[PDB]
Amino acid sequence: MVNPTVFFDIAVDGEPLGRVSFELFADKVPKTAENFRALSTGEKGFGYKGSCFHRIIPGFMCQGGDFTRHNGTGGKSIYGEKFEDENFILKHTGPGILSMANAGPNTNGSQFFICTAKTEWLDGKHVVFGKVKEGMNIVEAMERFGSRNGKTSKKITIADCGQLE
């Protein structure tokens, strides 16, 4: 079989920026990859389409996925409110890594972050489940609107998203 590829079309204050495609490691973390895949197609009746990146810290990461509160306090998985840390086989080795945000052990919901640098201090605490396949330049463009405290100067949204393969 093949690992699924999903995409996000990013917009800045409603102006289309571009498309970022991610490869999800379903062969290493099937449950975590499936969650992100289903939230991208919106097939369970809820998902990432229309949500925003509420926290961007230049040189660190872009965080998003809170489609219920749009502020870091919400979101939910396709398995109920939260699910377990599947495994920590993969590490935060550099720019482009896709990983799950959480609030402690076994609290995965829908929030995730895209690393713009190697973040080894998160290894073993956040489940890495994918990587940017194309469009890393769009993620770099996104960083420009972030700040040291995380607040963005423009509203960065996922205008559309779905599965390519």
Binding site: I57, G72, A101, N102, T107, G109, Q111, F113, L122, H126
Partner: peptide, 11 residues
């Protein structure tokens, strides 16, 4: 610091 949490963002 540099953490990625959901709810109580820490230093």
């Amino acid at each position: 610091x540099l953490l990625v949490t959901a709810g109580l963002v820490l230093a």
